[PDB]
């Protein structure tokens, strides 16, 4: 993305052509969790 | 053992001040990364032991 | 006045240890009780500093590179560093910077100069008024095309860094007890100031306090060392400073 | 309508059995905006901008630099003379809201055919040979057709560019050089030969030329924002600044939701925002007047609700997680609360554990099982 | 025997206070539920542990 | 393809204004006299 | 991507198209790596 | 295609396929006899890749 800072991108771009920027946070910000609750769920067992 | 706290009374009275600056533990809590208490507390693990 | 003071003894060059200088603040963000780290153009730790003397019989006063930063320094009294220049293969062909800080003011002055070839600032020695006044001043014969214009009202250390259009100088101050190297015990040099200014630059010389020729001036020293594309990892302390710094490399 | 509802929504069941349910977190959302910005009422050149009385030769591109002052830039997009009025940094109707820390304009004339190079990273030989913006470029590109103001019937030859270049120059460069290219191998000392070329070449803009073959004038305009002290501002007018409520906040165009307080905060002469570890503004200087505001987000948490199960009673209670029981009479309709029911705030009972406030739940010495568990040795069950 | 029990909300961590991403966030559908709920099912068995 | 309803909106415009009538477009007709929304869903036709 | 072939990509094609073909092998490749250290830590909890 | 005896007129401009092998400038353009050699849709130096 152009940034990061997702209030940034709301502040630069339209409604239709900051939606290309917001997706990608999207993505792999989801990316970033499934990543950690897999971590942690594999943890889980270990601790368990 | 050295610990990110167990949830003790987190009521924005440290993050709210001169803290949340310069605390990771706010920062977590502000991303809405929450850590949360056991249902047994420390006094009760001691009496069952 | 334009002048060729050329009394002189001619020397190699020569170096001394830098030890943990030239840390500066990377951008204009406070942070405080934190570590950070940033890849930036910044000073090689204990790299080989260059290391120039004014005495007597030797003005070791000649025009060094200026690729990439520089970080320059001076142990000093009489405050004999008066200024410098910077520009590129320098003829009037293309702009340069020049600063001063004379008796009443600092000068910035940004035109396509004619400068002179050892350039410097002329002082009264106690002549007669129990006292000492700038009279002279042998630094360029021509300034038609000007761009830039500003004027104001010991160890002493800067960062010059030139980058997409601003030249960007830090800068701190220290007393001394110590009898002539750069100190053990270090600080991040804060952001006096910064000039839009554009220009290439090449090279750069600086101007010092000084019968057209046979001279004298103050015993001083001065250093300089240039900055390197590096990883560094920082801390600020809670009053929200750098306090300590390493390099990645 | 009410928590339960709100668990009945999380769950896809119309009934919930016994036990306790997380939902959507609550937070206090903010009940104006502010804005603040330094200011100042001078307007920034447009006009000596635009209408110059002649445009640079784009080998020698003009750069002007801009300085503490007001754009109103939908003036400029309001002109319909403008062919193209292109944005990359921004989209144009966003400019008035935004405030930048230096802004450049780069000014010339080109063929309006070849207004396809000026945009960022492409390629064709003037943007390879003469002038071309980065791949992170932030500003916009504009463009129209000056036949009328700029065409000479035999051709206004005076525009000129480059058809030779040693390689590729660097983003945002100009040069002037002169010097005669070598073409062929040959050292072409002097300033002619067979294969040795003058490195520039012009235009004869008569007017019978085709569309786009015609003049046209060309700016860029642009900047770099939200990492210094701003200089330059769309018009929008500043307003109160508060301590101690939940605000919509504008700072320099460092817009943001939070709690604005005085800060302790020692900020040198030079800084102006402060950043969390997580790379999060939480600290900015005032531009009206040089002192540090703390920036905290408003209140907020999880909440969770307890039920003893709908076969069992439509009666729940809701604990706030994390927050002092003193902050959910804060928590009122003042504001639009993101669970939007607010009938367990009522009190009478409120009741503060170590895990949060829990509310619409007896608290009695008498101790039980943990039949469900809230947290930190407290639990709940359902009783006469 | 047990770890910090933690939840995460997938709407404060990715889109927090944007009520248009949180509309953008939607369009992945029930996958901003399953870490709320894959983190409640490893809170919870910190307990039972 | 059936449609469910359908809609002939017909007006006439300046040649350069045709950009206007893209779904997101901005600047006076697309400001005030005539606006596609954001997720417009059909097709456009203009002829000189 | 069209082509896995990494100098394909960065020679065939312009600086600023070519990296939205590289953004595809980036991240397909690093959901690979992430499929392979996933596998590898739920190996890993058996072979304990 | 150049060292060719006897050339057409314009008036009968012949023309060649050229096909199957390989064209370097590398010869053809450092030729000084070339009082004219000017290239459109692209530059003298990249005929040659
Ligand atoms: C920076 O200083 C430059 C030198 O003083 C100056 O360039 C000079 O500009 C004049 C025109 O005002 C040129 O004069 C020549 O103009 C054409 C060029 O082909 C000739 O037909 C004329 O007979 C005449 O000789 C000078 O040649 C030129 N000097 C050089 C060395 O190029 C710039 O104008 C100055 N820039 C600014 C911004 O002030
Ligand atoms: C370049 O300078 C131009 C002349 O000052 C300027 O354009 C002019 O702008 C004024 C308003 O500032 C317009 O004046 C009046 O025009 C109509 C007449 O019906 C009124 O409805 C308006 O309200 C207004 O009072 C001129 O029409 C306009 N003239 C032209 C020739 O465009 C430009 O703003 C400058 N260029 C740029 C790109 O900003
Ligand atoms: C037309 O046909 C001509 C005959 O083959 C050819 O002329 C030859 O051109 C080459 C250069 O391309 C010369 O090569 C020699 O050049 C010098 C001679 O001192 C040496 O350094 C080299 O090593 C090499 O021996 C030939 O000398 C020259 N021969 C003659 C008779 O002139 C043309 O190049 C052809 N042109 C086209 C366009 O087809
Ligand atoms: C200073 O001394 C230098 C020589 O050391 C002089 O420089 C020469 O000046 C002439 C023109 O007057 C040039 O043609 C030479 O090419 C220069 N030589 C060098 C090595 O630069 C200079 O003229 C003297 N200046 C003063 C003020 O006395
Ligand atoms: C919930 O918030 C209130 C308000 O800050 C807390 O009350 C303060 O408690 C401290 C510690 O006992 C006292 O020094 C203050 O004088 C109290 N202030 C007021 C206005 O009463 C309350 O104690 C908080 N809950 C907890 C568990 O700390
Ligand atoms: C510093 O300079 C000396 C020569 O005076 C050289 O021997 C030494 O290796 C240099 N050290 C570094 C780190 O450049
Ligand atoms: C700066 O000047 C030098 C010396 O002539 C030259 O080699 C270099 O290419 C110039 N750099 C820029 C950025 O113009
Ligand atoms: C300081 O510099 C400016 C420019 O050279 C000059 O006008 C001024 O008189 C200088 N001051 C003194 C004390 O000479
Ligand atoms: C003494 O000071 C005055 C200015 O107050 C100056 O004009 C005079 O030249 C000075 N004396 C000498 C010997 O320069
Ligand atoms: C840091 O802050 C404390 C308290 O104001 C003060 O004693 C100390 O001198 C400060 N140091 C600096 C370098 O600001
Ligand atoms: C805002 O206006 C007031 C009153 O004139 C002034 O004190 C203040 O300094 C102004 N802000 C800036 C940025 O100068
Ligand atoms: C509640 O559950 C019990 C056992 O299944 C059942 O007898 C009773 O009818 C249920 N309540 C209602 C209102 O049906
Ligand atoms: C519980 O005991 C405390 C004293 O320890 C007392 O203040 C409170 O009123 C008691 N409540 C009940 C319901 O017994």
Redesign the interface.
């Known amino acids: 993305a152009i940034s990061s800072v997702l209030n940034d991108i709301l502040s630069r771009l339209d409604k239709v052509e900051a939606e290309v920027q917001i997706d990608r946070l999207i993505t792999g910000r989801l990316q970033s969790l499934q990543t950690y609750v897999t971590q942690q769920l594999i943890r889980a067992a270990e601790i368990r | 053992v050295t610990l990110?706290d167990?949830?003790?009374?987190?009521?924005?009275?440290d993050?709210?001040g001169?803290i949340?600056?310069?605390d990771?533990i706010?920062?977590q809590?502000?991303?809405?990364?929450?850590?949360?208490?056991?249902?047994?507390?420390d006094?009760?693990i001691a009496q069952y032991t | 006045q334009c002048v060729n003071l050329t009394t002189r003894t001619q020397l190699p060059p020569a170096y001394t240890n830098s030890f943990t200088r030239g840390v500066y603040y990377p951008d204009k963000v406070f942070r405080?009780?934190?570590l950070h780290s940033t890849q930036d153009l910044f000073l090689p730790f204990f790299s080989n500093v260059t290391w120039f003397h004014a005495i007597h019989k030797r003005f070791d006063n000649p025009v060094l590179p200026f690729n990439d930063g520089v970080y320059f320094a001076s142990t000093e009294k009489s405050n004999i560093i008066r200024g410098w220049i910077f520009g590129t293969t320098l003829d009037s062909k293309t702009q340069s910077l020049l600063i001063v800080n004379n008796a009443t003011n600092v000068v910035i002055k940004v035109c396509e100069f004619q400068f002179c070839n050892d350039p410097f600032l002329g002082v009264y020695y106690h002549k007669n008024n129990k006292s000492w006044m700038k009279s002279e001043f042998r630094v360029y014969s021509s300034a038609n095309n000007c761009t830039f214009e500003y004027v104001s009202q010991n160890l002493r250390e800067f960062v010059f860094k030139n980058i997409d259009g601003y030249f960007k100088i830090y800068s701190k101050h220290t007393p001394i007890n110590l009898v002539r190297d750069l100190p053990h015990g270090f600080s991040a040099l804060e952001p006096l100031v910064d000039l839009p200014i554009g220009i290439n630059i090449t090279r750069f010389q600086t101007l010092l306090a000084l019968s057209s020729s046979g001279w004298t001036a103050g015993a001083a020293a001065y250093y300089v060392g240039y900055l390197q594309p590096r990883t560094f990892l920082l801390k600020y302390n809670?009053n929200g400073t750098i306090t300590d710094a390493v390099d990645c490399a | 309508l009410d928590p339960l509802s709100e668990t009945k929504c999380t769950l896809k069941s119309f009934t919930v059995e016994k036990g306790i349910y997380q939902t959507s977190?609550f937070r206090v959302q903010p009940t104006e905006s502010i804005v603040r910005f330094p200011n100042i009422t001078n307007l920034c050149p447009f006009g000596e901008v635009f209408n110059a009385t002649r445009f640079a030769s784009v080998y020698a591109w003009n750069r002007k630099r801009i300085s503490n002052c007001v754009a109103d830039y939908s003036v400029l997009y309001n002109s319909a003379s403008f062919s193209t009025f292109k944005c990359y940094g921004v989209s144009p109707t966003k400019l008035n809201d935004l405030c930048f820390t230096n802004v450049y304009a780069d000014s010339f004339v080109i063929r309006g055919d070849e207004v396809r190079q000026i945009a960022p990273g492409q390629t064709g030989k003037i943007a390879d040979y003469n002038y071309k913006l980065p791949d992170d470029f932030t500003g916009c590109v504009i463009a129209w057709n000056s036949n009328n103001l700029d065409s000479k019937v035999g051709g206004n030859y005076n525009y000129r560019y480059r058809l030779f270049r040693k390689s590729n120059l660097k983003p945002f460069e100009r040069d002037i050089s002169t010097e005669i290219y070598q073409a062929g191998s040959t050292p072409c000392n002097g300033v002619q030969g067979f294969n040795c070329y003058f490195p520039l070449q012009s235009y004869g803009f008569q007017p019978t030329n085709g569309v786009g073959y015609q003049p046209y004038r060309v700016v860029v305009l642009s900047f770099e924002l939200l990492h210094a002290p701003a200089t330059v501002c769309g018009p929008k007018k500043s307003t109160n600044l508060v301590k101690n409520k939940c605000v919509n906040f504008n700072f320099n165009g460092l817009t943001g939701t939070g709690?604005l307080?005085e800060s302790?905060?020692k900020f040198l002469p030079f800084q102006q925002f402060?950043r969390?570890?997580?790379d999060?503004t939480?600290?900015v200087r005032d531009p009206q007047t040089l002192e540090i505001l703390?920036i905290?987000?408003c209140?907020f948490?999880?909440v969770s609700v307890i039920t003893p199960g709908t076969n069992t009673s439509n009666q729940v209670a809701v604990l706030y997680?994390?927050?002092?029981c003193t902050?959910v009479p804060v928590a009122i309709h003042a504001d639009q609360l993101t669970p939007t029911w607010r009938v367990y705030s009522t009190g009478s009972n409120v009741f503060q554990t170590?895990?949060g406030c829990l509310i619409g739940a007896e608290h009695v010495n008498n101790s039980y099982e943990?039949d469900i568990?809230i947290?930190?040795?407290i639990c709940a069950s359902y009783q006469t | 025997v047990?770890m910090?029990?933690?939840?995460?909300?997938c709407?404060?961590?990715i889109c927090?206070d944007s009520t248009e991403c949180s509309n953008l966030l939607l369009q992945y559908g029930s996958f901003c539920t399953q870490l709320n709920r894959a983190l409640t099912g490893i809170?919870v068995e910190?307990?039972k542990n």
């Open positions: 990110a167990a949830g003790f009374i987190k009521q924005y009275g993050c709210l001169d949340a600056a310069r990771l706010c920062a809590k502000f991303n809405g990364l929450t850590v949360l208490p056991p249902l047994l507390t006094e009760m | 405080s009780s934190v809670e | 977190n709690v307080t302790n905060k402060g969390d570890i997580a999060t939480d600290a703390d905290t987000p209140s948490g999880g997680q994390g927050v002092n902050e170590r895990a943990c568990p947290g930190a040795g | 047990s910090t029990k933690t939840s995460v909300d709407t404060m961590y927090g809170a910190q307990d």
